[PDB]
Each structure stands twice: as C-alpha cells, then as structure tokens.
Design a protein around this ligand. Structure first.
Ligand SMILES: Cc1cc(CN(C)C(=O)NC2CC2)no1
Ligand SMILES: [Zn+2]
Ligand SMILES: [Zn+2]
Ligand SMILES: [Zn+2]
Ligand SMILES: [Zn+2]
Lengths: 71, 72
C-alpha cells in the first residue's frame, strides 16, 4: 500500500544517515576527538586535520563499535 | 499489507538498536574510551566504571554527535 511506501522511505533515510559523509559508501565507525563528531568511516577520518562539521582540530580519532553496525 | 507489518518491524528494530542498552529509553550518544563500545546514553555511561559489553575499565566517556540523532 501507500503506507508500505512511506515506511520504505523512513527506513532508507535512517540507513543513509549511518553512512560516511565523505565517501557515502562505508558505515560511520570513527569519532573526531575531542569535538565528538562521528560522521566518517575509518579511511575518510584518517587524514583529516580538522573536523568536517565544526572545524575543530582533530587531536585523534576514536574507533566506535555501534549496535547498528552490519557491514 | 503483510509487507507493511514487516517494514514496521524492521524500523522498530533499527530504532531500538539506537537506544541505550542499559535504560532502553534514551538515544545512544556516548562512547566508553578506550574500548570504543558506543552503547549507552550519557546518564547510564556516567555511572559505569567498567564497559557493559567488554568489561574493560572506562578511562573516560566521549560524547558522540551522530547524524541519526533525533529530539522533541
Ligand atoms: C565545515 C563547516 C561548515 C560550518 C558551518 N557552520 C556551523 C559555521 O560556519 N558556523 C559559524 C560559527 C562559525 N562549520 O564548519
Ligand atoms: Zn568514508
Ligand atoms: Zn566537530
Ligand atoms: Zn541509558
Ligand atoms: Zn567495551
């Protein structure tokens, strides 16, 4: 029904929000510290000097293990 | 249809996987460091000296800003 289409859209959007903001292909699994923005996969987070969301200096990257991980 | 019910269940399970594993009420927004398990809200994470997934000592809690976050 149309309701099934609405739910498919909600699911799609939530899944897309879990993907890296740079490559759009791999799941987010890295946090820029100390700001806390958690928006990249490990590869894309590796060479950024400053956060791509807030411009704060990246002192280090913390790997995150999330219950939503499926890749 | 039956597919509407299947999709409602998938959405519910994905939303539940984003909620704190301890209180089941608030969104996950905290990482236990250094182990990296990110399974709690800030209130539960502040009260645990050991990670509830791996039992490693919590040196400190890092707040995480995730694109999936929602609020009232
Ligand atoms: C990258 C990137 C884009 C942005 C946009 N934004 C939030 C601002 O410019 N904020 C103003 C206070 C300075 N911030 O970092
Ligand atoms: Zn990436
Ligand atoms: Zn930031
Ligand atoms: Zn909690
Ligand atoms: Zn742990």
């Amino acid at each position: 029904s149309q309701q099934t289409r609405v739910l498919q859209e909600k699911l799609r959007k939530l899944k897309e929000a879990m993907l890296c903001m740079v490559c759009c292909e791999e799941e987010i699994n890295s946090t820029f510290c100390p700001c806390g923005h958690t928006v990249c996969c490990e590869s894309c987070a590796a060479q950024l000097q400053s956060c791509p969301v807030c411009r704060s200096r990246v002192e280090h990257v913390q790997h995150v293990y999330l219950p939503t991980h499926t890749s």
